[PDB]
Design a protein around this ligand. Structure first.
Ligand code: ZN
Length: 287
């Protein structure tokens, strides 16, 4: 069949920050790729003045605005539309700017059930989400991991026909890639106010030995990631060469074409000399 991949993320922007080049790699090769976003990003902050009054401290309309940002970003990556877990607006994120519908406080029967329904409908060959620490500990990222882990297990056996996801991966930050990438930046790649952080300010990184797979995307796919990040204008600032970006904290990272993964469930396919698979579909018999 045509391969089917599912990426499950907490907020609008995370899909591009983490998996933009992988998503673009697979959609350009004709795979069916879907992104599930668990919240609208209602509690986000905004870069710049134009949309400053949309945040939760003023009009509290930022999540609605971010639907268009996500849609634009997904389109840049070859994905036709967003999917919000439980429907757009079901569960609210926990951000910087009281709620009776916060995703972290949600009834697990409802969040796991929603995701299980998605997995059983789509029948993905691959599911991707955060590691157990959510990347850098954001409560919504940790909860997405919890919900997704539970959904993958339960989707095998809720209504519908059981589907055992062939390969379940965690998206992680590759330390050696980030270091190499950062070393390759030049001052032209950064805005004056940016600083290159040490890895521990932005993520719980992984050594080469703790990584199972890499998707080493081409320049077309990296450019699609750059465009996707640009679409999230309230959240990300892309640098002048499209080689680095920063969030509102001014901590700049390289926009790399290589994305790394830990195989959490399933059997690996053929690994390269680093001991890494080079295709999330490895071993599944796709030509
Ligand atoms: Zn996030």
């Amino acid at each position: 069949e045509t391969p089917r991949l599912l990426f499950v993320h907490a907020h609008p922007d995370d899909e591009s920050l983490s998996n933009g080049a992988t998503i673009a790699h697979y959609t350009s090769r004709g795979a069916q790729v879907h992104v599930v976003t668990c919240t609208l990003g209602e509690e986000g902050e905004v870069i710049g003045d134009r949309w400053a009054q949309l945040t939760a401290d003023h009009a509290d309309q930022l999540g609605g605005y971010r639907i268009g940002e996500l849609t634009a970003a997904l389109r840049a990556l070859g994905v036709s539309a967003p999917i919000y877990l439980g429907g757009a607006g079901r569960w609210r994120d926990s951000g910087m700017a009281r709620s009776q519908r916060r995703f972290v406080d949600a009834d697990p029967r409802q969040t796991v059930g929603a995701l299980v329904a998605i997995i059983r409908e789509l029948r993905p060959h691959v599911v991707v989400t955060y590691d157990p620490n959510g990347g850098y500990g954001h409560p919504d990222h940790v909860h997405t991991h919890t919900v997704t882990t539970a959904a993958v297990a339960a989707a095998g056996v809720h209504p519908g026909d059981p589907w055992t996801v062939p390969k379940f991966y965690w998206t992680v930050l590759g330390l050696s890639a980030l270091i190499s990438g950062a070393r390759a930046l030049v001052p032209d790649d950064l805005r004056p106010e940016w600083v290159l952080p040490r890895a521990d300010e932005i993520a719980f990184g992984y050594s080469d030995d703790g990584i199972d797979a890499v998707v080493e995307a081409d320049e077309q796919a990296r450019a699609a990631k750059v465009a996707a990040l640009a679409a999230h204008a309230t959240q990300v600032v892309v640098g002048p060469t499209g080689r680095a970006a920063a969030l509102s904290n001014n901590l700049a990272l390289p926009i790399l074409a290589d994305e790394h993964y830990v195989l959490a469930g399933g059997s690996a396919g053929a690994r390269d000399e680093r001991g890494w698979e080079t295709d999330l579909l490895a071993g599944l018999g796709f030509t």
